[PDB]
């Protein structure tokens, strides 16, 4: 009579379909998803230091638009800019706005040290009706609007050296007056000019007399520029009119900091990977949530799903 | 599939085997039973965990990068920024697709291999006492009670004990 | 006596050599080519909308050089620029020519809407001998050359808002006069200036008195600039001389459009993939025809040939 | 090559077999013949078509990109544009080279596998009625006419019918 | 590992075999010896040299590229330059990691395959004159002196010469 | 009695650990390193033509700072810039310094042809105390400092066509005077301007009166620009003051040339692959020495080591 001995393998009633080199649909006993495709919808406030811009762009917090006064000297791993943001100080533009935004974002601090410039031969602290601070005509906190002193305006020539061990970052500007009603009123002459230089660099700017289309009822503009001054180097400001002057310098650091555009709310939770849609887990090697990420994140891919087999071929009974 | 055991000479899997991936079924004087083989099951499982350890929880930190969405038309520089990112995503998407297709082919083949090795090991063990019926089953040409079947599963089966009985059964008329 | 049963496999008299992981030359029974290496030499006019520039660059068709009059308001999936092209209107340059070319190419339309600007205080429609249209001194169709009115030229100040739901694209320019024979003749004063601004942006330009080396016998130049005006925003043109003004705006769209440099002829055929050498088929995953492509195309690689085995190893008899 | 059948224990291929990839040759009382095996042939073919379906007709649409040829010297920005494109082409060229080398190794191995599986299946079928001569051929120790050979090819061969005849031939002196 | 010979049914390697990768050990009337098999050794070696020829000495020339270190803060354009280079390095680093992991899995499997093929070839050669003991060794059921052992290693062993002697030893009581 | 025949494989007492798809630590009999991780520390002077900049930047050798006089007309495959370099002629800046540096580096030659410009109406060959050549006040060898002739300075208008078959490269500049002590002394009037144009291009520059922070005791600056003139085209220099003029043109070539920042010494040896750390061998496909390379080099990867198995699994006795 004897016996029979049969070798065999398991199978399951609920198999999953995977792709292979030779077959786009093979059923295996089990698989796991390699593409992360969902967020909880909130940016977790840990373990990265988050700075919610709220109504303020990075640039507005930098210049010191009064509604951004709470941002003075703050640091961030990630600054979050909201779509609801708006400026509410003097109208301005920044040639190469994107680069200034980027280099501040990456520096990851708004640390500002005040400096005593020898401003004699002008009226400091010019203000306006479009930049309301504490219910009183004001200006950008980090800028110093310079106007005349008694129907006159001589050739300025102020110097300030960098004896520190970090790059100093100087933000400064030009006023472009709406007509000749504010070219003979705050500067006392027909023409103006500004020259901000160093040992290695020189930037010069011409004020522009002309009307602009109103932005919150003001038809004049400021134009914002910047200058980096290294250790051992010096800043010079030659000016014959129109100077929007620095009150000091920002410290520029290097590290892991950045900026992200998102309307997702900030949650009280812990997640290493942030996208504009919210935090996502990072167990999986790939993700299709957003090409924009910050932190230890899965890599962005075009696919919705990629199933890795974790069992043998399923051959049901 | 490449070794020919799973979805080949073994007609199908056993839904009733829930405590292992590979194993044995027998019919003898004392009835019909099933036991899982732990070593072959654990071999397949370790290899798949090896693949998992390479892919799960292994991410890369990135911080400040380039912008990837734009609200204004700008031309040259924006074209390059978009192109760099689109290039990168296509290369990673390619890597992910190929990875899964290759790993999956290999997982299917290694699991088939483990079945085949257990079958082969068992065949050698039986020496002249059994014949391969071609469907993963051996006809054993001697009385082989539960302890005897257990001895084969446990690698303690002594083929000399039964050889005279089996040769006589095998080469009859 | 018995019998003999032999298991075996096929072989062929004409094998092909392929590469493998362990051997750079193994013969298999059959293979297929994965690199596309030939074109028919013609750009198929289907299924993409082709616009042959012929004698015109995109920029000449945009500005409206008389020989490009047939291009007014046309659209394209792919604009083809020919090496034989040349300008035959007023000599000009475009700072960042490449960016303007790119953004128009990508927009994929020359749709132009005329607009009524309040030009009083100047003579409109200036012409010249270098821009012959219909056998008569003319100018760029989309530009309006503005000169004096009776030995005088006051401060212009024209406004035009964008109430539409698309970006408006404004093309405008400066004239740079050859000497003082055309600085006191068309503008009636020593000096000039142009300021084209919006709510968010401002561009200002100084005319330049000076002789240039002749290009089709003319030693003056125009310089071309552009301005994008979004929905809700406004365009302002302050000018005290020298303005080459828009007659209206171009619509800017987004989609699949582009531009390609090629001398290949346009054929009456259907092909998804276009290169500068002509259309190519797209059955194969790779191609070594051209790194420049448009449409559903194989990916460019450095190799001439890559043979994928489609049969077993060939072991001849 | 990895299984050892094609370009291994099978000395060479058959140019005379034009209706299949794998098959049988026999010598018996009624002559010497050849028949193709459709199932193994179709198994190999399906797998290769699977690879083809992944690679043929699967292209990506691209539209406006960056410029890739230049008539003027410009420096920094042009360097970056050229570098991005050269980087991309080298990565794709690498992908194409590796793909072909791996797929080709695997095609050679899977086809060898299909030969090996057919051989193995046939060996089990014959039980104690034949012996492996080591060159892909079996010596069958019984009269096996055309219908009998056909029964082996068709999977209907009943080994018990011939077993007494074969054992007697096998274990003679 | 995928064939089951090396680190499977062969318990371990032989440190005393210094003139080949694969070979034979025997015990017979004349003593206990060892000889390397050159053909299987050379098969494995050629395949690994094939991989080496693809990877060693095959570099790419590059000349003027982009800058990759910077002494000044600049923003947008510098971000893109750094991003392009970081993107590229991650893709190549990925390629190198995957290459080594795959080639290494395949080297281990091909070498196991060569052991398995030699074992299989030797088993067929012995026909009915020996049995597989399950540990890579055959019990040979006939007097097999040094010349006889040499005949098996050299592929000149004539199994008919010993078959009567061996069958008689194999099927005793 | 019979015999026993055992099949087997080798093993070694000194195995090496490798990674695989299924196991991060498997011991094999032998392996080889795929990542090159060491340099000898010297840049081999063969087989690429090396030009050690020593105290000179490429730009200083180009402009012709006296200490760089030995570099005139030299060629290179690779120009090596040293961290110890410094300028010792007139203080200057180059807007888009990086692009000029790059295009000269890539051209791979300093070949300079002198040209006879019709300079009448000015004093040529201006010198200074900050650019000492052969113990005598001098200037940049390839520039020609143009000042007045007898309390006067008329409108210059010099032309020079390119009849050659290569691009000509013209280097030129503006002087920015420290005060009005050197605006009425070398140019004889209140104001100045420079316009360097061609058939296709025009660049114009305004001199800037103002003091800068001293760099080797000089508070004036030059600003350096460049112009490429193709075959069939012409160069024009209109100038009313302040011109730092070319003495001729550089030939611009194309080929394999570049530039590298390194302090590694130059050795008398032969190596195809150069990094800033020194030459490295190129047997291996990958390297972790430096992302900056020149020549036939292994590809840069993040890993320190990658071991490729060259033998079977080691299973010791
Ligand atoms: C089909 O195939 C998959 C993959 O092989 C199997 O899923 C795995 O199952 C194991 C065991 O159940 C899981 O291990 C557990 O991991 C938990 C960590 O959770 C997160 O992190 C992992 C990555 O590390 C993510 O993949 C995962 O999605 C989670 O977000 C631990 O918390 C668990 O610990 C608990 O149990 C152990 C017992 O050993 C205790 O030590 C602990 O105290 C604790 O109680 C555990 O280690 C693994 O996460 C699963 N992986 C995946 C990718 O899902 C399926 O089991 C399999 N299905 C079948 C039917 O076989
Ligand atoms: C060596 O290996 C290759 C690849 O395995 C084989 O070539 C293939 O052969 C098949 C069958 O002959 C071909 O199938 C045909 O495809 C045609 C489409 O043509 C274009 O598109 C394909 C991609 O889809 C391109 O690869 C190709 O180059 C063409 O540009 C169809 O029109 C055919 O249809 C005709 O026959 C069928 C019969 O089933 C009918 O239904 C139709 O009415 C019509 O008459 C057909 O489907 C396939 O294109 C080939 N591929 C390649 C890549 O070349 C060789 O056959 C093989 N050689 C040997 C000796 O075996
Ligand atoms: C462990 O595994 C590795 C790889 O399989 C083995 O190392 C190889 O061994 C061979 C033979 O000894 C070496 O071949 C020799 O190459 C020399 C060239 O040297 C440089 O270039 C190679 C690339 O081509 C680099 O990889 C290498 O690092 C060197 O920088 C030749 O000069 C040699 O020629 C000499 O011997 C031959 C004999 O045939 C004569 O023709 C010549 O006249 C001359 O005397 C030789 O060709 C090979 O370089 C090694 N490769 C690597 C990557 O190291 C180990 O042998 C192996 N270990 C064990 C114990 O097996
Ligand atoms: C961030 O700003 C919002 C919005 O307030 C501004 O909305 C602009 C569109 C514009 O109209 C501007 O004049 C206006 O001030 C603040 O919410 C608003 O706050 C005001 C004053 O406290 C309230 O009257 C409103 O209820 C409220 N509006 C909405 C829609 O919520 C908000 O206070 C501010 N947040 C922070 C953190 O400063
Ligand atoms: C596109 O232009 C060509 C070329 O015409 C121009 O060639 C320039 C180099 C220059 O000399 C310019 O003055 C000249 O007009 C046109 O072909 C030419 O057309 C003229 C006038 O009809 C004929 O006399 C010529 O035979 C002919 N020349 C050539 C070489 O073909 C062509 O008409 C025009 N195409 C379109 C579609 O507008
Ligand atoms: C490259 O320059 C070095 C350094 O010389 C300069 O160092 C600057 C920091 C600055 O002080 C400058 O004034 C100074 O000339 C040359 O080496 C120096 O040469 C001088 C004069 O021959 C000697 O007195 C010094 O011994 C020597 N100093 C050092 C530190 O080595 C060097 O000659 C020159 N090399 C070439 C190839 O031109
Ligand atoms: C240039 O034109 C603009 C638009 O007409 C002028 O701005 C308007 O001026 C009126 C009356 O002075 C203001 O009440 C409006 O708020 C402005 N309208 C718009 C739509 O912005 C501007 O003043 C003109 N320039 C000069 C110098 O007069
Ligand atoms: C995460 O956010 C992105 C960006 O908004 C989403 O992608 C966009 O989805 C909208 C609506 O489906 C489309 O109109 C856009 O074209 C998409 N943009 C891009 C850049 O792809 C995405 O759907 C969100 N993902 C999740 C998981 O919530
Ligand atoms: C500056 O120089 C150019 C070149 O000499 C002058 O242009 C030439 O002028 C003559 C006579 O007036 C013309 O007939 C030629 O066509 C021009 N020659 C070339 C080669 O272009 C230019 O006029 C000069 N500038 C001034 C203000 O006179
Ligand atoms: C398609 O066109 C390209 C571009 O002209 C050709 O590639 C050039 O070929 C010429 C002549 O052989 C070389 O001098 C250039 O260096 C090549 N340029 C580039 C960018 O590679 C290519 O040969 C054409 N291909 C086909 C199949 O016709
Ligand atoms: C603008 O300020 C600078 C700095 O005070 C002046 O340069 C200094 O001038 C003194 C005396 O004239 C020199 O001895 C020093 O070498 C300079 N000092 C520094 C720190 O650079 C400059 O002259 C001023 N501008 C004008 C027009 O007087
Ligand atoms: C080759 O040179 C590079 C660049 O200096 C070295 O990498 C730097 O090493 C220093 C000191 O360890 C670090 O502070 C830097 O962050 C590194 N820079 C970069 C860009 O990675 C590298 O160590 C040298 N390699 C060898 C083999 O000598
Ligand atoms: C199959 O069913 C069980 C129980 O319902 C479930 O936990 C398991 O995840 C399922 N597996 C797959 C691969 O769908
Ligand atoms: C300008 O304002 C600041 C900040 O309120 C103040 O400290 C300073 O005294 C003011 N300066 C002058 C010159 O009044
Ligand atoms: C072999 O020959 C036939 C008939 O001439 C041909 O159609 C086939 O494509 C050839 N195959 C290869 C792989 O060269
Ligand atoms: C300018 O020319 C256009 C187009 O021919 C014409 O409609 C318009 O009336 C002209 N304008 C004036 C002010 O004459
Ligand atoms: C093992 O030892 C020998 C002799 O000492 C040595 O040459 C060889 O390279 C070593 N191999 C490995 C893989 O470590
Ligand atoms: C300027 O110097 C050069 C070079 O020393 C000399 O050949 C030339 O004659 C000088 N020019 C004048 C006008 O003196």
Numbering used by the authors:
A (entry chain A), C (entry chain A), F (entry chain A): 9 to 325
B (entry chain B), D (entry chain B), E (entry chain B): 1 to 173
Question: Which passages does the manuscript contain on this structure?
Answer:
With the knowledge that HA mutations G186V and L194P exert an opposing structural effect on the RBS and that the HA G186V/L194P double mutant was highly deleterious to the virus, we were interested in examining the structural effect of the HA G186VL194P double mutant. Of note, the HA G186V/L194P double mutant abolishes virus replication but not HA protein expression. We were therefore able to recombinantly express and purify the Bris07 HA G186V/L194P double mutant. Crystal structures of the Bris07 HA G186V/L194P double mutant were determined at 2.25 Å, 2.1 Å, and 2.4 Å for the apo form, in complex with 3′SLNLN, and in complex with 6′SLNLN, respectively. In all three structures, the electron density for the 190-helix was very weak to absent compared to that of the Bris07 HA L194P single mutant, whose structure was previously determined in the same crystallization condition (Wu et al., 2017b). This observation indicates that the 190-helix in Bris07 HA G186V/L194P double mutant is extremely disordered. When mutations G186V and L194P are both present, the HA RBS is disrupted, explaining the incompatibility of G186V and L194P. Mutational incompatibility between G186V and L194P is an extreme form of epistasis and can be attributed to their opposing structural effects.
Influenza virus hemagglutinin (HA) engages the host sialylated glycan receptor at the receptor-binding site (RBS) to initiate the virus life cycle. Since the HA RBS partially overlaps with several major antigenic sites (Wiley et al., 1981, Wilson et al., 1981, Wu and Wilson, 2017), egg-adaptive mutations can dramatically alter HA antigenicity and reduce the effectiveness of seasonal influenza vaccines (Raymond et al., 2016, Skowronski et al., 2014, Wu et al., 2017b, Zost et al., 2017). Based on sequence database analysis and virus rescue experiments, this study revealed that the two most common egg-adaptive mutations on H3N2 HA, namely G186V and L194P, are incompatible. X-ray structures illustrate that individual G186V and L194P mutations have opposing effects on the HA receptor-binding site (RBS), and when both G186V and L194P are present, the RBS is severely disrupted.
